[PDB]
Amino acid sequence: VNIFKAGADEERAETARLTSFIGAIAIGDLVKSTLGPKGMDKILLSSGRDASLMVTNDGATILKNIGVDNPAAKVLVDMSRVQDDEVGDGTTSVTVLAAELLREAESLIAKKIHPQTIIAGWREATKAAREALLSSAVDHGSDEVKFRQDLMNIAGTTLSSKLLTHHKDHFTKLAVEAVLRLKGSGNLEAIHIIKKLGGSLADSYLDEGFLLDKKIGVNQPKRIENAKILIANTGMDTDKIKIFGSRVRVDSTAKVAEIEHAEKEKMKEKVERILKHGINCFINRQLIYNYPEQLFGAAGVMAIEHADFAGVERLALVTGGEIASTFDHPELVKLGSCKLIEEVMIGEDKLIHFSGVALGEACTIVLRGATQQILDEAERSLHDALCVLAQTVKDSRTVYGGGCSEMLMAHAVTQLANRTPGKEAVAMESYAKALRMLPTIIADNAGYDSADLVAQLRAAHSEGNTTAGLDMREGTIGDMAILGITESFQVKRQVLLSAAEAAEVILRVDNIIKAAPR
Amino acid sequence: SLAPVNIFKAGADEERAETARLTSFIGAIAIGDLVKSTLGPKGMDKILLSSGRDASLMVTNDGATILKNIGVDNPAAKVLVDMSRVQDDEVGDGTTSVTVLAAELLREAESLIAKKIHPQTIIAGWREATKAAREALLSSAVDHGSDEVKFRQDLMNIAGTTLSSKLLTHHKDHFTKLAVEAVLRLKGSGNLEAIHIIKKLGGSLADSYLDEGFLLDKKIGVNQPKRIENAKILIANTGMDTDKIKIFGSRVRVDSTAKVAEIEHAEKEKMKEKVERILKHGINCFINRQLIYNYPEQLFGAAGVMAIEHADFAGVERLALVTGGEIASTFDHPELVKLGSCKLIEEVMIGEDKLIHFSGVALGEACTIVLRGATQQILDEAERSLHDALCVLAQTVKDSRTVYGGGCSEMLMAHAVTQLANRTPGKEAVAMESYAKALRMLPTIIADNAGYDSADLVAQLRAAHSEGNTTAGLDMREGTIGDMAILGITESFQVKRQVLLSAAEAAEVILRVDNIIKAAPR
Amino acid sequence: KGAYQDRDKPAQIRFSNISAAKAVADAIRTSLGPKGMDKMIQDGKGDVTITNDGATILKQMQVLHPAARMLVELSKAQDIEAGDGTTSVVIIAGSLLDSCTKLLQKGIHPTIISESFQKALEKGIEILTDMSRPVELSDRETLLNSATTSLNSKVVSQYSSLLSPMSVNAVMKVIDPATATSVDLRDIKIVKKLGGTIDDCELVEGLVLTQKVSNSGITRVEKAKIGLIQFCLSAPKTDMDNQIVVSDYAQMDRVLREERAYILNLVKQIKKTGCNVLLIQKSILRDALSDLALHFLNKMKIMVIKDIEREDIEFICKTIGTKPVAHIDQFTADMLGSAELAEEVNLNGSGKLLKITGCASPGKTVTIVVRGSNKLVIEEAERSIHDALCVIRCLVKKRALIAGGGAPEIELALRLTEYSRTLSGMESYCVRAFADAMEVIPSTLAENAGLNPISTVTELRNRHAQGEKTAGINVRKGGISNILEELVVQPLLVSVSALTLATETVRSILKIDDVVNTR
Ligand SMILES: Nc1ncnc2c1ncn2[C@@H]1O[C@H](COP(=O)(O)OP(=O)(O)O)[C@@H](O)[C@H]1O
Ligand SMILES: Nc1ncnc2c1ncn2[C@@H]1O[C@H](COP(=O)(O)OP(=O)(O)O)[C@@H](O)[C@H]1O
Ligand SMILES: Nc1ncnc2c1ncn2[C@@H]1O[C@H](COP(=O)(O)OP(=O)(O)O)[C@@H](O)[C@H]1O
Ligand SMILES: [Mg+2]
Ligand SMILES: [Mg+2]
Ligand SMILES: [Mg+2]
Q1: What is the distance between the alpha carbons of residues A382 and A173, in angstroms, rounded to a whole number?
Q2: Which sites bind ADP (chain A)?
């Protein structure tokens, strides 16, 4: 007898894990074609309204854009998005590793092994692998030149799997420089990425100051030397007295004429109070109406209308001023400083160029490609590189990439498995196989002999050479210490832990109950 | 072909990529998983229920009828089903094993292709591996036949091991010898049609027996005697109902009714003359192939001779085999026709029916087996299992070479494939290793059906065969590793060779398709 | 710590099969014993039946589940082998499948359950065989008691005084109780005609025909000389194509004269043998009777009967003693049956029958004619009489007799539970489940009779534990008492076959682990 609903169903057997495994493997196979320096990106086309088209390489936006149906696919997409939020890298890596973990899981359950046995084996294996990765982590930060070289290597390895690889030598350092302007503040919003079409992608440059996409007023000057910027968050509009319930109730036209004259005079006195600070520039958050603009033009200052919260925050960071709202006491927290406020033209548009800024705490990156999709992909991948660089500035521990860290931690898992009895050992062996399946995939997407390369790496790591990985520009087994394929320790640790946790949570379901759709 | 022009038809499609091999592999693996749960002595049989006319229902364990009855749509599944049917036709059993082994081979092939290895490499590696397995199985194929008692014990063991995976295992010790006896009555003639299996409801399955004579499900005449001692049976294939002159265009054209009366009297006279010519043979039991009308029935009754009417071609051939008679159509020379002889042709009641019982037959060349179960499905399954046992026994009588069962023979040829793979370079070695793994999967499935530690038992057998013990296999009664010579789990060598070769060749032909093109349906 | 058995599909299939079998069992569970009432089946077409036979109930009720089909086939197989107990067998099968679903819930492999069930079967056969007593034929009392016990649970129970003695007379008048070892029920011809009441059923040692006499001038013949005819009494015609050409005016008169002379010659040849009534076989392709032939036969003061089926000629010959005649020259008095009387009987305006009584060579054949108000009661009376005949057949087959009224299965349940208490292991639970799974028959005997089932079964177990065997449920007394004193017995073959077939069917069902829907 059926009891649920019309449209509600239950899969309480091998069918449930069949659906979960096939969905996770579909996610893994879709994401798999975008790993390594030789990975190839994808086109996302919307069948709905506006037919949005986006060319992308990373797995986070690929998985979040598509509409997944299988709940396991939803689990993988959520894990990828969470991992992108946490660090900003390895979303494709974590999704692929989870997919291979589930594949080895179904292979094991074919051999009639209880899922909790696999769970215990995986817990022990991930503990050992995390311990080995932590033991193999190299650290810097005390050094200055060595840490800068490490940052350059991290940017290179993060940016080599994307389109900017075509000009990687130009871009990596640029990204590093941007992070070097943050001065340790974990504020990625201090970085502005302005994307304008036209010209090769090698024309992109990190500005030596700031760029604002706003407009000068009518009568204000359009160039200043030795700027004294005051940044404000005042009204400058009609500017109601804010006492709700106030109205003019008079008996003549002279009275209302006098009241409007008083309103204009109070606005004039507010502008005079602003000018008393000793300024030649003024940046406001919301609109500036016609009378304050006229007064500013007459006085001889420069005013900016409608610079949003992000704009004023970035100007405050790059110039050093405070966000003013009340100008009663000009002697309190002071202004900012620059050296030129020239208007500079890019493409066909004009932007305000703050040069000679007092502080480098914020900056702008100009992205200029030949196609809007190229601009979007460059922006997303540059965001990933900046995220990783900021994360490794916060925590300078690094581990070698190219599969070397994966190979060594898989070797540790294998060594632990060899000394553990029972059916746990095969679970840990499957864990190690799934973990080693990543460099296999990188070589496959590259197009080399994956089996030979992986066997060579296994032999080299078992011997003791703990810095061996895939040299992809030639396709052999090289030394990541000499070559310089580094990676953030935080990124790899988060990838491992998140993938293992998602595999564990998915594997222990034996019943899927779907309610009737709305 | 995904090109922005479509050329095939409104209904025809093409899969010219990994999609085609994906569909073929998933279909083949689905068929293999369907058959997988019916292996070993611990396998459990399945229900086949119709969705239409008469709603036919059958309980069966062998995979041949399972694959024949269900309607497959994937072309790879069609290849597997035809494989199973051909293998059933060739020997009689191993359909489940051949389907399972081909499915496991294709699963290993998909796992290999996942590692980006060209399919022709897998095909060449499997050709070499199956050559090595053929050589190993032939080398290990022990032979008997010079001895008498050893060959009969081998026959009993083969019948027991072939019948152990079906329902009849519940009375194995009673049935196997039965099957053996049946084949031993054929005197080496590979004519399974000499075995007639009469199925009647009622009574436990242990009440089945092989008769000491022949049973015929026909009727005696009206005035004929119902019991004859020391008969001289004459078997005929005459009409003797109306006897048309067989000259078309002949008619009576007379001017009076008395002429017609005389002509019809002459017709009855020629009927009487033919019956008298038949009786001149000196007989007391007459067996016909088609009907005997009332006048010849009356003539036979007056004479005092039995007359069996409307026995089909199979009936007259089986009576000729079991009694020694000669199929006759003319009776001009009674001295040239040889008449069969029996001892008693009385009537015996079984279930609720009466049958003619030829007892004390002159020759045992043919025989009948009475199956009496509790349910029509039980009767059908018993008949199918007995047919498989008889087919295997006849095959091993034709070719006495035997190999040890229980997983020993397949383990040893898998070990030979492994030894071959360990000395070959290149990507063919991994293909040979996959072949060995797929071949070793069969005892794994047997243990899985039984409910034992498949990995531990398979590792034990791998070690035993690698060390040098080539007569080790699975002991099901306790689930351990035992010596098949002592247990006597024999099997026909031809059956195993056929399974191996057919599975290998069909896997090879399926593995090398990269385009499935479906024309629009009717 | 063991195989994971990931696939739960086989367990679900087994539970579904067990549930369907239990549903079929307890659907007809209310039709057991002398207080269980019969069902009414109205099939898709405009046909209705009122039946208490378990086999017919299960056949007419077109079931869908494969296990239900297995159970209906089991019931028909038990009907074939025994003929009575076709309800108790399906009840037992469903009940012990219901018992074994709990075992499946306890983590016991189906093969172990099946083997333990077979062992319990082997023990129960011995228990039942030892419990019985030998029986000797030609003892009217035991035969009558067995027939009455068979008929009690049927609609004709109130007529058991008139149906049991005739039911045993029918069997005793076919076989020789010296060396029979079986009985052929084909020669017990049952003829049904509408009208009258059940109390007018009759047994005749002669022959009963549903045909009508061609000539309505003679209907009663005394000292009749019956003779079968297999040739046609019409104008002669050869097997090959026949044509008569006429080229003169005298040819027409001549051909008519020859036809008349030939017919009259045939009729005179028939008459000169002393034949008193004629039985003409039904001959398609040639009118066995012509107007001229019937005219001549009626002129010679004879009785003529036509349209006799080819399948009844053996029955007629075995009954009255005639021999088939397919040629006129072979028609003589040496092969001509004789009877004391031939009559055309009218059943008070509800049809007509032919009765041949007083055959000078009484063969091993009798006939039963049944009377009833509507068709349904007539069909049910036929089924009940057939069940009584099958009971006598089983008693003839093997000579052994056991008590009824729940005594055999309850005593077997005891002896088997103390047998299980000696087989400690994994199979002890399965054997105990088999032992306690056949308490269903006494429980339902108590329930359908209006007694309290729990207390009745408890008292039954206690009284058979005290050695007071042959104790069971009495519905006349309304309690529990000795059964042989109540004159309720049944042949051992019934119960033994029921148990064996039920156990075999369950052992076969328990081996299923998948279902596939063929095209
Ligand atoms: N130039 C390179 N040489 C060798 N290995 C690399 C290189 N670039 C990336 N990898 C490896 O490829 C894996 C995935 O890289 P990538 O595609 O950049 O991940 P994501 O798409 O999350 O940025 C990383 O674990 C890294 O070790
Ligand atoms: N009692 C047994 N012990 C061990 N192995 C057995 C036993 N009976 C059968 N087998 C093995 O099971 C295999 C499959 O046989 P079966 O299940 O009858 O299907 P098929 O005969 O179609 O392959 C055979 O190869 C045989 O060696
Ligand atoms: N007079 C009676 N008193 C007690 N029990 C009876 C009596 N008559 C029959 N029974 C019981 O009823 C059971 C079922 O008999 P019945 O219903 O006639 O056949 P079936 O089981 O085929 O329906 C028998 O096992 C018998 O023991
Ligand atoms: Mg990266
Ligand atoms: Mg077999
Ligand atoms: Mg009864």
Answers
A1: 12
A2: 36, 90-93, 160-161, 402, 487, 492
Domain boundaries for CATH 1.10.560.10 within chain A: 9-139+396-516
Start-end of CATH 3.50.7.10 domains in chain B: 219-356
Asked whether the beta carbons of C280 and C233 are under 8 A apart, the reply is: yes
> Does one domain contain both C211 and C330?
yes
Q: Any binding-site annotation on B93?
A: yes
Residues A426, B98: contact at Cβ < 8 Å? no
B94 is in an annotated binding site: yes
CATH 3.30.470.20 fits A215-352, yes or no: no
Class of B144-218+357-399 per CATH? Answer: alpha beta
Which residue of B37, B83, B161 sits with most ligand 2 atoms within 8 Å of its CB, as the best mutation to test the pocket? B161
**Residue C90: inside a domain:** yes
- Check whether domain B13-143+400-520 has CATH 1.20.1250.20, yes or no: no
Residue ranges around ligand 1 (CB below 6 Å): A 35-37, 39, 58, 89-93, 157-158, 160-161, 384, 401-402, 442, 470, 472, 485, 487
Q: What is the CATH number of domain B219-356?
A: 3.50.7.10
Architecture of domain A140-214+353-395 in this structure: 2-Layer Sandwich (3.30)
What's A9-139+396-516's CATH class? Answer: mainly alpha
**Is C422 tagged catalytic?**
no
Taking an 8 Å cut-off on Cβ atoms, the answer to whether C505 and B374 are in contact is yes
Within 6 A (CB) of ligand 3 lie C 32-34, 54, 84-88, 149, 152-153, 404-405, 445, 473, 475, 488
| Domain match, C311 and C405 both | no
Residues C332 and C257 in one domain: yes
Residues 6+ apart with CB under 8 A from A266: none
Residues of chain B with CATH 3.30.260.10: 144-218+357-399
Q: Which residue of C has its CA nearest to B42?
A: C111
Examine the domain organization and report whether C433 and C378 are in the same domain: no
Q: Give catalytic status of residue C513 as yes or no.
A: no
> With helix as H, strand as E and coil as C, how does C30-93 read?
CCCCCCCCCEEEECCCCCEEEECCHHHHHHHCCCCCHHHHHHHHHHHHHHHHCCCCHHHHHHHH
Specify whether the CB–CB gap between C414 and C464 falls below 8 A: yes
Q: C422: number of CA atoms within 13 Å, CB side?
A: 7
Say which CATH number the domain at C26 has: 1.10.560.10
Angle between helices B119-140 and B95-113 (to 10 degrees): 140
Residue C480 lies in a domain: yes
Q: Name the residue among B71, B70, B72, B133 with its Cα closest to residue B101.
A: B133
Which of C1, C4, C14, C513 should we substitute to test contact with A (largest number of A Cβ atoms within 10 Å)? C4
Q: In sequence order, which residues have a C-beta less than 8 Å from that of residue B243 and are 6 or more positions away?
A: B270, B271, B274
Burial level of A510, CB count in 10 A (0-12/13-18/19+)? middle
In terms of DSSP H, where are the helices of C132-274?
Answer: 140-152, 160-172, 249-271
Chain A environment of C3 (Cβ under 8 Å): 112
Whole-angstrom distance, CA of residue C461 vs CA of residue C466: 9
- Using an 8 Å CB-CB cutoff, list residues of chain B that contact chain A: 115-116, 430, 448, 454-455
Find the CB nearest C80 among B245, B264, B351. B351
CA distances from B268 to A402, B221, C237, C261, C327 (A): 105, 19, 12, 20, 8
**How many angstroms separate the CA atoms of B500 and B98, rounded?**
7
Residue labelled with tokens 């005084």: C161
Let me know: does B303 contact B284? Beta carbons within 8 Å: no
- Alpha-carbon Rg for chain B, nearest whole angstrom, is 30
CA B175 – CA C356 distance, rounded (Å): 52
Taking only residues 68 to 127 of chain A, the set having a beta carbon closer than 8 angstroms to any beta carbon of chain C reads 109, 112-114
